[PDB]
Structure 1
Amino acid sequence: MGKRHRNLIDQITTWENLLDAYRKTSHGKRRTWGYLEFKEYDLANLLALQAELKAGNYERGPYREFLVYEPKPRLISALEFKDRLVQHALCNIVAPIFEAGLLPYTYACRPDKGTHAGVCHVQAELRRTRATHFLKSDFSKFFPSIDRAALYAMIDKKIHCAATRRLLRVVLPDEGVGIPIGSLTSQLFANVYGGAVDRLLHDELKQRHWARYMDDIVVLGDDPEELRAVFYRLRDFASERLGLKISHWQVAPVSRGINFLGYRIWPTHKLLRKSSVKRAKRKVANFIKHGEDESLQRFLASWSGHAQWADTHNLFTWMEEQYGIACH
């Protein structure tokens, strides 16, 4: 690599890449009407999708916009398998040329960096540097505030390919605020978009002990006043540059726990979020009072992995006291 990137729709529409996109788009969706209707003539559908992309005639199918309401109401707009496949074809060539420039401390929707690598970086970067305080911010409606215009000043500072730029502008028109949450193209662009505040933490502001997961941003420090100044500088930027309002923020001392990514993260210990605990508790309970106690063991083994890192035992005892079943 060396900047530019001016021939991407050739790679986006390569059959070897669209097959990867097809595989990625189908991964886990192989029981859905989208895949099963597509899987019928999959390589023929991939041929008319390749020749729709490579020809410049791909039009993104309409988002079917439901509102999932689970943690909080989110207007989650789903896409057709053909459209989720094109997004996967884009975010196979376009994602690793954005995710390459994302400072290493961004842990969202990136290979090898995740929900856990973040909670380990916050907590690790809490142990080293011996942070006394921390700034945790969060962007109001992040996806429904991404400007989709200043974003296409970052997606157009790295794509340079007049055709990929147009495929990205059929997936995500470069108009007004509102990146559809519930799209692969969107997690990247949101991570890319949120990556602007990363560079204002790490490049400007010279903050080296921080972590961003999409819209959540932890900034460990040493003065609860320098971290407050960093936030004010971060908030003023993300507002006047990116149009992202800060919903919640806190410059707390490292003592109040860094509520980062389903783990309240102290330097020493790291519990879980009570919401995740209670959600799993009630989910096991609903599953109980619905009639499933054998798939629960599959879930429990699963959630025992998400909770093996946290110093839990504040659920497994509880659930052993409610039903008697041997968890661990």
Structure 2
Amino acid sequence: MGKRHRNLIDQITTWENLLDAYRKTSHGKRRTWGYLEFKEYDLANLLALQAELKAGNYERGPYLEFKDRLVQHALCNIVAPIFEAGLLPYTYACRPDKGTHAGVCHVQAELRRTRATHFLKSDFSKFFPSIDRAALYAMIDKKIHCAATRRLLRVVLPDEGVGIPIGSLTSQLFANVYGGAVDRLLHDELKQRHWARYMDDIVVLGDDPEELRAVFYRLRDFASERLGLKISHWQVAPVSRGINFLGYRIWPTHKLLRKSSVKRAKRKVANFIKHGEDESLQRFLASWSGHAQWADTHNLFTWMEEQYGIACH
């Protein structure tokens, strides 16, 4: 909005927000030690959080706590819409009114509207464990401009390391940003007008399967040197193999679910929980967090963190 966004810590710590954040943080997490210990004195908790954030004395506890997820939700209520507006239409991950489904539809559509002939489908590396958390904060910082939101973003996600912590509302929006770079190297540069990124995977329908392969090389070279994410699950398939984007392989004709893996994992986790084996689950989780770091499984990673409260790290 006129760029700038130079006073977000005022809106992040509005009660009206630290409550929205509260209600969003407690959504589903209302059977957790964190909500239940917070809820006790919870608009007094939110009054000492509001006034931690409004002071610049918010200090994230270790990996999240309820307040930490609430601070994240209170950031990502004011930060999110000022990044998620610079997220080209065709990024289908963790945004509002543009969910998973809308992408399995955009992709299909953009394979129909301009029927296309061929397509690329990449899938960045451990997007979150690979995010510079550094050239991320050169995008979380060409848009924040509020030097306190910026310092709250940098508590909520430190401006070092190489690893956006998987499953943080912050990450989500952030990786849909340190990913949007590649969306803005597809759609802006590269003039790829038909694509769809849901975090890591950037389907890129073409017509010269040789052009998509170019696009992909250009995308990988970019996202590896600017963004530090090493694409690997890439293909340049003709539109016929089906674009395994967002769990639905979406060829112009219908789009059938993929899963099996998700479902297997979902079940594996659920079983582990109701087996008292929540310590080998960390091993399994670490494993599946490797098989899925490549895939756009972030909203899925948030989803699984929301369902079982499982810090995979």
**In the superposition, relative to structure 1, how do residues 147 and 275 fare at CA in structure 2: closer, same or farther (>3 Å)?**
same
CA distance in 2 between counterparts of 1:301 and 1:59 reads 27
Which residue does 2:236 correspond to in 1? 251
Q: Is the 8 A contact 2:75 2:153 kept in 1?
A: yes
Using the TM superposition, name which of 307-316 and 53-62 deviates more: 307-316
Q: Is the 8 A contact 2:131 2:229 kept in 1?
A: yes
- TM-fit CA distance, 1:228: 0.2
Deviations 1:263-307 (A, max 9, x none): 111111211105258639978997999999999999999999999
Q: Is the 8 A contact 2:132 2:228 kept in 1?
A: yes
Using the TM superposition, name which of 55-64 and 144-153 deviates more: 55-64
Which residue does 1:162 correspond to in 2? 147
Q: Is the 8 A contact 2:169 2:302 kept in 1?
A: no
- TM-fit CA distance, 1:54: 0.6
**In the superposition, relative to structure 1, how do residues 228 and 196 fare at CA in structure 2: closer, same or farther (>3 Å)?**
same
CA distance in 1 between counterparts of 2:40 and 2:49 reads 14
Q: Is the 8 A contact 1:149 1:174 kept in 2?
A: yes
- 1:286-301 superposed matches below 5 A: none
Q: Is the 8 A contact 1:272 1:310 kept in 2?
A: no
Using the TM superposition, name which of 135-144 and 297-306 deviates more: 297-306
CA distance in 1 between counterparts of 2:148 and 2:299 reads 53
Deviations 1:73-121 (A, max 9, x none): xxxxxxxxx0000000000010000001100101111111111011011
**In the superposition, relative to structure 1, how do residues 129 and 170 fare at CA in structure 2: closer, same or farther (>3 Å)?**
same
- TM-fit CA distance, 1:247: 2.2
**In the superposition, relative to structure 1, how do residues 124 and 307 fare at CA in structure 2: closer, same or farther (>3 Å)?**
farther
**In the superposition, relative to structure 1, how do residues 110 and 306 fare at CA in structure 2: closer, same or farther (>3 Å)?**
farther
Using the TM superposition, name which of 275-284 and 19-28 deviates more: 275-284
**In the superposition, relative to structure 1, how do residues 282 and 37 fare at CA in structure 2: closer, same or farther (>3 Å)?**
closer
CA distance in 1 between counterparts of 2:310 and 2:30 reads 33
Using the TM superposition, name which of 13-22 and 303-312 deviates more: 303-312
Q: State the percentage of identical aligned residues.
A: 100
CA distance in 1 between counterparts of 2:159 and 2:286 reads 44
**In the superposition, relative to structure 1, how do residues 309 and 212 fare at CA in structure 2: closer, same or farther (>3 Å)?**
closer
**In the superposition, relative to structure 1, how do residues 305 and 119 fare at CA in structure 2: closer, same or farther (>3 Å)?**
farther
- TM-fit CA distance, 1:218: 0.2
| SS of equivalent to 1:251 | strand
| SS of equivalent to 1:193 | coil
Using the TM superposition, name which of 313-322 and 176-185 deviates more: 313-322
Using the TM superposition, name which of 18-27 and 269-278 deviates more: 269-278
| SS of equivalent to 2:185 | helix
CA distance in 1 between counterparts of 2:2 and 2:307 reads 59
Runs of 4+ deviating beyond 4 Å:
280-328
User: Where does structure 2 lack aligned partners over 5 or more consecutive residues?
Assistant: none
Q: Is the 8 A contact 1:263 1:310 kept in 2?
A: no
Output the aligned Cα RMSD: 8.6
Q: Is the 8 A contact 2:126 2:292 kept in 1?
A: no
User: Where does structure 1 lack aligned partners over 5 or more consecutive residues?
Assistant: 67-81
**In the superposition, relative to structure 1, how do residues 296 and 230 fare at CA in structure 2: closer, same or farther (>3 Å)?**
closer
Deviations 1:198-245 (A, max 9, x none): 010001000001000011110001011000000000000001111100
Q: Is the 8 A contact 1:127 1:268 kept in 2?
A: no
Q: Is the 8 A contact 2:93 2:100 kept in 1?
A: yes
Which residue does 1:14 correspond to in 2? 14
**In the superposition, relative to structure 1, how do residues 136 and 163 fare at CA in structure 2: closer, same or farther (>3 Å)?**
same
Q: Is the 8 A contact 2:130 2:228 kept in 1?
A: yes
CA distance in 2 between counterparts of 1:323 and 1:170 reads 25
Deviations 1:44-63 (A, max 9, x none): 00011011111111100100
CA distance in 1 between counterparts of 2:63 and 2:280 reads 32
**In the superposition, relative to structure 1, how do residues 311 and 271 fare at CA in structure 2: closer, same or farther (>3 Å)?**
farther
**In the superposition, relative to structure 1, how do residues 43 and 276 fare at CA in structure 2: closer, same or farther (>3 Å)?**
same
Q: Is the 8 A contact 2:200 2:296 kept in 1?
A: no
CA distance in 2 between counterparts of 1:304 and 1:213 reads 17
CA distance in 2 between counterparts of 1:258 and 1:159 reads 35
Which residue does 2:305 correspond to in 1? 320
Alignment partner for residue 209 of structure 1, among 179, 184, 194? 194
Q: Is the 8 A contact 1:107 1:115 kept in 2?
A: yes
- TM-fit CA distance, 1:128: 1.3
**In the superposition, relative to structure 1, how do residues 62 and 267 fare at CA in structure 2: closer, same or farther (>3 Å)?**
same
**In the superposition, relative to structure 1, how do residues 249 and 280 fare at CA in structure 2: closer, same or farther (>3 Å)?**
closer
Q: Is the 8 A contact 1:137 1:217 kept in 2?
A: yes
TM-score (norm 2): 0.84
TM-score (norm 1): 0.80
Q: Is the 8 A contact 2:63 2:311 kept in 1?
A: no
| SS of equivalent to 1:315 | helix
| SS of equivalent to 1:208 | coil
- TM-fit CA distance, 1:127: 1.2
CA distance in 1 between counterparts of 2:62 and 2:299 reads 44
